[PDB]
Specification:
The structure is cut from a larger assembly and holds two copies of chain A.
Chain A lengths: L11 H10 L4 H9 L4 H18 L3 H8 L3 H15 L3 H6 L1
Helix pairs in contact in A: 1-2, 1-3, 3-4, 3-5
Chain lengths: ~100, ~100
């Protein structure tokens, strides 16, 4: 059921962001988020995955880093910019 | 019962740290601590000796300096570094 190994990924930045988030690589995750098409949803996904992995982390330092992921802050700030710009396209983006 | 005056001290940094701590010379004590083999235990010893001498100090300035010795802070920060590094060798160090 796996796709063709020879095909280009339809959402390459989405895939790279997921791959970097799933292994607590927050700098690359920030870069792939800043290079992605849908950044508010991506930041919310990153927030969810980080708070899900914070429970599974064995080391205290990694768990602390996951608990201080600040991806929800990225979503909030980007939506603040969007809502200041239009305040009507912002609702469409929300829905 | 005193040892040989001609022999090298087995723990020279330990002896210098004790000598500097016992006379409220905190800069040399910090140097000898930073140059010692077992620094968490040495910092805890310095904390103990400083809080013991703070009661015996006659002048208020010296007593204040002893009461602000911040050797326990050195032990805490070094153990924070050690616990962040391994978190398993840290327990062995503790025990």
């Amino acid at each position: 059921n796996l796709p063709d190994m020879d095909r280009r990924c339809e959402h390459p930045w989405r895939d790279l962001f997921l791959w970097a988030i799933l292994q607590n690589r927050q700098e690359m995750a920030n870069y792939f988020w800043a290079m992605g098409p849908e950044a508010v949803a991506a930041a919310l996904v990153g927030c969810k995955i980080m708070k899900e992995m914070a429970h599974l982390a064995t080391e205290a330092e990694s768990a602390r880093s996951m608990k201080n992921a600040k991806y929800e802050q990225f979503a909030m700030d980007l939506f603040s910019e969007c809502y200041s710009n239009s305040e009507d396209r912002a609702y469409s983006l929300l829905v």
